[PDB]
């Protein structure tokens, strides 16, 4: 009877977003919290039903308020006495399904070593902006770090080159990742 | 242009694991190492005119000596034991490729590269073989080159003329590999 | 500066809670975690920030509602997860399996096969190879796609001989029967 | 001679720009680094962000402690300023370069001293800042510094790249060329 991990991670930080909550079953994300609306947002449609559950409304509020307190009261004191931990994010881009030309597919931009959790993601086609399908899902991981996923729907073609461009919003550091057709599969 | 730089280095030297350990603190003014604390000597010692005052003074402070005498255990061994899994125990496969310069023509001299990249640690053995006989002669290495990201890279070039009936093999052996890697060249 | 309060529940397929931890971090430093045996917050950090870790423990320990909350924490997990936990442990998506050649690497072999496996969940999967219906030794953990599906692949280097038939054998719970994909040079 | 050499606190502070640094290194490779005026602590690789095992935060204090000592050494030496050594610049790709296959160019700069330098990537004479990554100052046994700059790119036979470095040890900005065949 194997074990599974349910992770409830409330985090807050200097700058925006000033606070955030991420729940996850094993590695993958179930909900992220929208505080302005005060409710769970499901990662997938199929989780919609249990986003309403309000058993822990108070517990969450407590944590949020405390976590925030830590940032506001402590931190201005450590400011300069202690160095603000940060990583430089790592991006890699890969297709969701095996590459076949002329067949619709999806580029995934997987951001890792993200800390602090403050970013925006942008796609480019031959160094030309391109609107990315859907939002950018940030998620906390074991180790007190974070990761993010962004997707782009496209139909791959031989000459294609794509790039994913991550902007770490503290100091606007940019981190890129290129993608090109590599070892495409025959169609049958 | 007027600038002054001060450095300090708390070096730890390990052999046979943690068996023998030498702790060496070095104090630098600009590029001049003016004084150092060598565990094997037990005392601070002025190396240059600049270090005489500090050398004598710091030896007078017994709290300091003892503190920096345990550094062997409290600093070197302590951190070694902590990092081991991700430092000494770090092993990353090389990516081996073999290609020729100047597109190969029969009977004309050429150089074929054995490029070996992305591996760690940097200690590696690379050899050339022609029809099973280890060809040592006309061999040029670059030695391990640090990429600055915990990976090394090397290229070993062999002088040869592409005559038919000759097959060239680059043979790479490395700590990360459970069995040496071989790559072949054709020619035509 | 970033801070965490990480509640993590560990439960089996049945829904019976096996562990519960509640931890407080600052600047990516784990400072203090709940200690049930002691029924209070206990600093996990004995270094530069230890001072702080103590401070935070006390500020939290004088909180009363929290103390009952955490003492019954193991229950909360089972109670909170109850509705969906069965659906998640029942969740499985079938893997797609496609086999084709790919550029060889770290091999003297002229041909390299790739067994692609995607769109599957959970991540637990097994991939082996057969040459004319007999086991062989391949030349990894699945890559999450962030959308509750995983992909991975296996490789096999070889020399082609027309007659030979190579087969990729995938097995995954989200599929009812083993999946086989073949390949022949020709 | 030794099997391994760890160095825990190769650190420096220099008068110019009141800059300074505190790092841990193992076998000439860096685990993390603290920059003084950024007041940041950065781990070179994700695995070194554990904090159990690899705790920075001692930095700044290390920089503070070492800075304290500067002013006196300065006057004790009859104000012996730092000399400007010329750095040597190298450029090469991280993995094998194949046309169209994405890759990373690496600018490597040795014998940097003092540690006050500009390094910039150029594509066809145009400066490139988007997606570039660089290290803090790495250390040399002779007590100079190293530095790494990284630039991801898609090799094409249509463009060239230059890594231009500017140092007081140079008469004018020198740039190191690279292009595929
Ligand atoms: C599940 O977790 C509990 C507590 O950590 C442990 O005692 C038990 O052995 C685990 N079971 C399995 C199958 O891993
Ligand atoms: C190396 O260390 C091992 C275990 O500590 C010990 O058996 C041996 O004495 C050491 N060998 C040498 C050459 O020092
Ligand atoms: C680096 O570039 C900036 C802007 O051009 C300049 O202020 C500074 O003098 C340069 N530093 C060096 C060492 O040349």
A31 and A88, same domain (yes or no)? no
Q: How far apart are CA A4 and CA A24, in angstroms?
A: 10
Burial label for B63, CB within 10 Å (0-12, 13-18, 19+), is exposed
Q: Please tell me the residue having the least CA distance from ligand 3 atom 7.
A: D118
Q: How far apart are CA A49 and CA C13, in angstroms?
A: 20
Pairing mode, if any, of strands D4-14 and C179-183? unpaired
**Chain breaks after residues in chain B, where C lies over 2.5 Å from next N:** none
Contacts of D178 (CB under 8 A, 6+ apart): D91, D92, D93, D105, D160, D161, D162, D163
Look up the domain containing A181 and give its range. 74-186
Query: For the CA atoms of D103, D107, D108, D114, what is the dihedral angle to 10 degrees?
Result: -150
Phi, psi of C30 (to 5 degrees): -70, 115
Q: Which of D73, D84, D94 sits opposite B1 (nearest CB)?
A: D84
- What's the distance, CA C167 to chain centroid? 27
Contact C150, C121 (CB under 8 A): yes
Q: How far apart are CA A17 and CA D78, in angstroms?
A: 52
Structure tokens at D133: 């990554």
Burial label for D38, CB within 10 Å (0-12, 13-18, 19+), is middle
Structure tokens at A125: 């086609």
Contact C152, C117 (CB under 8 A): yes
Contact B135, B128 (CB under 8 A): yes
Pairing mode, if any, of strands A84-86 and D40-43? parallel
Contact A131, A162 (CB under 8 A): no
A68 and A22, same domain (yes or no)? yes
Burial label for D148, CB within 10 Å (0-12, 13-18, 19+), is buried
Domains in chain D (CATH in brackets) are: 2-81 (3.10.320.10), 82-181 (2.60.40.10)
Phi, psi of C82 (to 5 degrees): -35, -55
Residues of D in contact with A145 (CB under 8 A): 46, 49
Closest residue in A to C81 (Cα–Cα) = A6
Contact state of A174 with D131 under an 8 Å Cβ cutoff:
yes
Contacts of A104 (CB under 8 A, 6+ apart): A153, A154, A155
Instruction: Indicate the helix (H) or strand (E) that contains D65.
Output: helix D61-68
Q: Please tell me the residue having the least CA distance from ligand 2 atom 4.
A: B19
Q: How far apart are CA A48 and CA A41, in angstroms?
A: 8
Residues of C in contact with A65 (CB under 8 A): none
SS (H, E, C) B60-118: HCHHHHHHHHHHHHHHHHHHHHHHHHHCCCCCECCEEEEEECCCCCCCCCEEEEEEEEE
> What topology is assigned to B89-188 in CATH?
Immunoglobulin-like (2.60.40)
Contact state of A84 with C1 under an 8 Å Cβ cutoff:
yes
Structure tokens at C69: 């909350």
Q: How far apart are CA C185 and CA D22, in angstroms?
A: 58
Q: What is the DSSP letter of D52?
A: S
Contact state of A108 with C89 under an 8 Å Cβ cutoff:
no
A105 and A45, same domain (yes or no)? no
A111 and A182, same domain (yes or no)? yes
Q: Show the CA angle centred on residue B16, arms to residues B15 and B17, nearest 5°.
A: 90
* CA-closest candidate to residue D110, choices D91, D93, D90, D135: D90
C177 three-class SS: coil
Contact A89, A113 (CB under 8 A): yes
Q: How far apart are CA C52 and CA A70, in angstroms?
A: 11
Q: How far apart are CA B143 and CA B123, in angstroms?
A: 9
Pairing mode, if any, of strands A119-125 and A39-42? unpaired
Query: Which residues are C183's β-sheet partners?
Result: C166
Contacts of A99 (CB under 8 A, 6+ apart): A105, A156, A181, A182, A183, A184, A185
Contact state of D41 with A174 under an 8 Å Cβ cutoff:
no
Instruction: Indicate the helix (H) or strand (E) that contains C87.
Output: helix C73-89
Contact B169, B160 (CB under 8 A): no
Residues of C in contact with D58 (CB under 8 A): 48
Q: Show the CA angle centred on residue D141, arms to residues D136 and D143, nearest 5°.
A: 65
D40-43 sheet: strands from edge to edge: A84-86, D40-43, D29-35, D19-26, D4-14, B5-15, B20-29, B32-38, B44-46
Query: Number of folded domains in chain A?
Result: 2
Interface residue of B1, B7, B73, B143 to substitute, partner D, most D CBs within 10 Å: B7
Q: Please tell me the residue having the least CA distance from ligand 1 atom 1.
A: A3
Contact D131, D151 (CB under 8 A): yes
Q: How far apart are CA C109 and CA C106, in angstroms?
A: 9
Query: Which residues are A130's β-sheet partners?
Result: A123
Structure tokens at A93: 């881009």
Contact state of C107 with B169 under an 8 Å Cβ cutoff:
no
Q: How far apart are CA B58 and CA B63, in angstroms?
A: 10
Cβ C100 under 6 angstroms from ligand 1: no
A86 and A62, same domain (yes or no)? no
Contact D99, D73 (CB under 8 A): no
A32 and A106, same domain (yes or no)? no
Q: How far apart are CA D39 and CA B44, in angstroms?
A: 31
Structure tokens at A151: 């997707």
Nearest chain C CA: its distance from B170 CA (Å): 9
A176 and A83, same domain (yes or no)? yes
For chain B, which residues lie within 8 Å of any Cβ of chain C, measuring from their own Cβ? 93-97, 169, 181-184
**B62-71 vs B52-60: helix axis angle to the nearest 10?**
90
A43 and A80, same domain (yes or no)? no
D181 three-class SS: coil
For chain A, which residues lie within 8 Å of any Cβ of chain D, measuring from their own Cβ? 79-88, 90, 112-113, 115, 143-145, 161, 165, 174-180, 182
Token match 């998620």: residue? A139
Q: How far apart are CA C11 and CA C85, in angstroms?
A: 9
Ligand nearest to the CA of B18: 2
Phi, psi of D153 (to 5 degrees): -160, 165
Structure tokens at B105: 């023509």
Pairing mode, if any, of strands C2-12 and C17-26? antiparallel
Cα dist from C105 to A90, B119, C99, C113, D90, whole Å: 25, 15, 17, 11, 28
Look at the alpha carbons of B79, B85, B89, B91 in this order and tell me if their dihedral is positive or negative.
Answer: negative
- Touching chains C and B? (3+ Cβ pairs < 8 A): yes
Residue-by-residue DSSP string for C43-86: E---SSSHHHHHHHHHHHHT-SHHHHHHHTHHHHHHHHHHHHHH
Question: What resolution in angstrom units was achieved for this structure?
Answer: 3.2
Contact D136, D36 (CB under 8 A): no
Atom of ligand 3 lying closest to residue D167 CA: 13
Cα dist from D85 to A151, B48, C155, D88, D145, whole Å: 49, 21, 51, 10, 11
**Chain breaks after residues in chain C, where C lies over 2.5 Å from next N:** 139
Nearest chain B CA: its distance from D129 CA (Å): 19
Contact A119, A89 (CB under 8 A): yes
State the CB neighbour count (10 A cutoff) for residue B149. 18
Cβ C19 under 6 angstroms from ligand 1: yes
Quote the ligand 3 centre to D61 CA distance (angstroms): 29
A50 and A33, same domain (yes or no)? yes
Q: What is the DSSP letter of D76?
A: H
CATH number attached to the domain at B1-88: 3.10.320.10
A53 and A87, same domain (yes or no)? no
Cα dist from B99 to A183, B109, B131, B154, D24, whole Å: 19, 14, 17, 14, 39
Instruction: Indicate the helix (H) or strand (E) that contains D149.
Output: strand D145-153
Cis peptide before A12 (omega within 30 of 0): no
* CA-closest candidate to residue A29, choices C29, C124, C149, C90: C149
- What's the distance, CA C159 to chain centroid? 35
Structure tokens at B97: 């490729």
Domains in chain C (CATH in brackets) are: 1-90 (3.10.320.10), 91-186 (2.60.40.10)
Instruction: Indicate the helix (H) or strand (E) that contains B45.
Output: strand B44-46
In chain B, where are the structural domains located? Answer: 1-88, 89-188
Burial label for D166, CB within 10 Å (0-12, 13-18, 19+), is middle
Cα dist from D52 to B79, C46, C47, whole Å: 11, 10, 10
Determine contact: C108 vs chain B, CB below 8 A.
yes
What length is written for chain D? 181
Burial label for A40, CB within 10 Å (0-12, 13-18, 19+), is buried
Query: Which residues are B133's β-sheet partners?
Result: B130
- The domain boundary, picked from A23, A40, A73, lies at A73
Cis peptide before C30 (omega within 30 of 0): no
A78 and A108, same domain (yes or no)? yes
Closest residue in C to A183 (Cα–Cα) = C102
Contact state of D51 with C49 under an 8 Å Cβ cutoff:
no
Structure-solving method: X-ray
Contact D148, D106 (CB under 8 A): yes
**First and final C-alpha spacing in chain D:** 41
Contact state of D57 with C27 under an 8 Å Cβ cutoff:
yes
Q: How far apart are CA D51 and CA A88, in angstroms?
A: 16
- The domain boundary, picked from A17, A39, A73, lies at A73
Q: Show the CA angle centred on residue B69, arms to residues B64 and B75, nearest 5°.
A: 100
State the CB neighbour count (10 A cutoff) for residue B135. 18
Cα dist from A18 to A15, A71, C110, C130, whole Å: 6, 9, 55, 54
- What's the distance, CA D116 to chain centroid? 10
A99 and A161, same domain (yes or no)? yes
Determine contact: D52 vs chain C, CB below 8 A.
yes
State the CB neighbour count (10 A cutoff) for residue C74. 17
Residue-by-residue DSSP string for A93-143: EEESS---TTS-EEEEEEEEEE-SS-EEEEEEESS-EE--SS-EEEEEETT
Instruction: Indicate the helix (H) or strand (E) that contains A69.
Output: helix A57-73
- What's the distance, CA B60 to chain centroid? 38
Residues whose beta carbon lies within 6 Å of some atom of ligand 2: B 16-17, 19
* CA-closest candidate to residue D40, choices D69, D17, D63: D63
CATH number of residue A6's parent domain: 3.10.320.10
In total, the C-beta contacts within 8 angstroms joining chain A to chain C are 153
Structure tokens at B57: 């003074």
Cis peptide before A89 (omega within 30 of 0): no
- The domain boundary, picked from A51, A73, A95, lies at A73
Q: How far apart are CA A131 and CA D75, in angstroms?
A: 61
Q: How far apart are CA B43 and CA B51, in angstroms?
A: 13
Q: How far apart are CA D52 and CA B86, in angstroms?
A: 13
Residue-by-residue DSSP string for D3-26: SEEEEEEEEEEETGGGEEEEEEEE
């Amino acid at each position: 009877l194997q074990n599974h991990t349910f992770l409830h991670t409330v985090y807050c930080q200097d700058g925006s977003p000033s606070v955030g909550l991420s729940e996850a079953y094993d590695e993958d994300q179930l909900f992220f919290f929208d505080f302005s609306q005060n409710t769970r947002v499901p990662r997938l449609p199929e989780f919609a039903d249990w986003a309403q559950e309000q058993g822990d409304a108070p517990a969450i509020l407590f944590d949020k308020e405390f976590c925030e307190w830590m940032i506001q009261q402590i931190g201005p004191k450590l400011d300069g006495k202690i160095p603000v931990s940060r990583g430089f994010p790592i991006a890699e881009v890969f297709t969701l399904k095996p590459l076949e030309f002329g067949k619709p597919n999806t580029l995934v931009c997987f951001v890792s070593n993200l800390f602090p959790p403050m970013l925006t993601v942008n796609w480019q086609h031959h160094s030309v902006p391109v609107e990315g399908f859907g939002p950018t899902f940030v998620s906390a991981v074991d180790g007190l770090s974070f990761q993010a996923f962004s997707y782009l729907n496209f139909t791959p073609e031989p000459s294609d080159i794509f790039s994913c461009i991550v902007t770490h919003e503290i100091d606007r550091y940019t981190a890129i990742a290129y993608w090109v057709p590599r070892n495409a599969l025959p169609s049958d | 242009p007027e600038d002054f730089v001060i450095q300090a280095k708390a070096d730890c030297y390990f052999t046979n694991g943690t068996e023998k350990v030498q702790f060496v603190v070095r104090f630098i003014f600009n590029l001049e190492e003016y004084v150092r604390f060598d565990s094997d000597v037990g005392m601070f010692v002025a190396l240059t005119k600049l270090g005489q005052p500090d050398a004598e003074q710091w030896n007078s402070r017994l709290d300091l000596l003892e503190r920096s005498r345990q550094a062997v255990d409290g600093v070197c061994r302590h951190n070694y034991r902590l990092g081991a899994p991700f430092t000494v125990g770090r092993k990353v496969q090389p990516e081996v490729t073999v290609y020729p310069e100047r597109t190969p023509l029969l009977h004309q001299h050429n150089l074929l590269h054995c490029s070996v990249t992305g591996f760690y640690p940097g200690d590696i053995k690379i050899k050339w073989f022609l029809n099973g006989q280890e060809e040592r002669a006309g061999v040029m290495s670059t030695g391990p080159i640090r990429n600055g990201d915990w990976t090394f890279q090397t290229v070993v070039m062999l002088e040869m003329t592409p005559e038919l009936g000759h097959v060239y093999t680059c043979l790479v052996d490395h700590s990360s590999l459970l069995s040496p890697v071989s790559v072949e060249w054709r020619a035509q | 500066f970033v801070a965490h309060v990480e509640s993590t529940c560990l439960l089996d397929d049945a829904g019976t809670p096996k562990d519960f931890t509640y931890c407080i971090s600052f600047n990516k430093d784990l400072l203090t975690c709940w200690d049930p045996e002691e029924n209070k917050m206990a600093p996990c950090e004995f270094g530069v920030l230890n001072s702080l870790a103590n401070v935070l423990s006390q500020h939290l320990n004088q909180k009363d509602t929290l103390m009952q909350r955490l003492r019954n924490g193991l229950q909360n997990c089972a109670t909170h997860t109850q509705p969906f936990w069965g659906s998640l442990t029942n969740r499985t998506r079938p893997p797609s399996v496609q086999v084709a050649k790919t550029t060889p690497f770290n091999t003297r072999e002229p041909v390299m096969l790739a067994c692609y496996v995607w769109g599957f969940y959970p991540a637990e999967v097994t991939i082996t190879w057969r040459k004319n219906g007999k086991l062989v030794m391949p030349h990894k953990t699945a890559q999450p796609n962030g959308d509750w599906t995983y992909q991975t692949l296996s490789h096999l280097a070889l020399t082609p001989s027309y007659g030979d038939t190579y087969t990729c054998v995938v097995e995954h719970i989200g599929a009812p029967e083993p999946i086989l994909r073949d390949w022949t040079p020709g | 001679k030794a099997d391994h050499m760890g160095s825990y606190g190769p650190a420096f502070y220099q008068s110019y720009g009141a800059s300074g640094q505190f790092t841990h290194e193992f076998d000439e490779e860096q685990l993390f680094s603290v920059d003084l005026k950024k007041s940041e602590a950065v781990w070179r690789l994700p695995e070194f962000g554990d904090f159990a095992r690899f705790d920075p935060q001692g930095g700044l204090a290390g920089i503070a402690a070492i800075k304290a000592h500067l002013d006196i050494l300065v006057e004790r030496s009859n104000r012996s300023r730092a000399i400007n050594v010329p750095p040597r610049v190298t450029v090469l790709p991280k993995s094998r370069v194949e046309l169209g296959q994405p890759n990373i160019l690496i600018c490597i700069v040795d014998n940097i001293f003092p540690p006050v330098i500009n390094i910039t990537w150029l594509r066809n004479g145009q400066t490139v800042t988007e997606g570039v990554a660089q290290t803090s100052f790495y250390s040399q046994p002779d007590h100079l510094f190293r530095k790494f700059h990284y630039l991801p790119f898609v090799p094409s036979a249509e463009d060239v790249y230059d890594c231009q470095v500017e140092h007081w040890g140079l008469d004018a900005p020198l740039l190191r060329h690279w292009e595929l065949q």
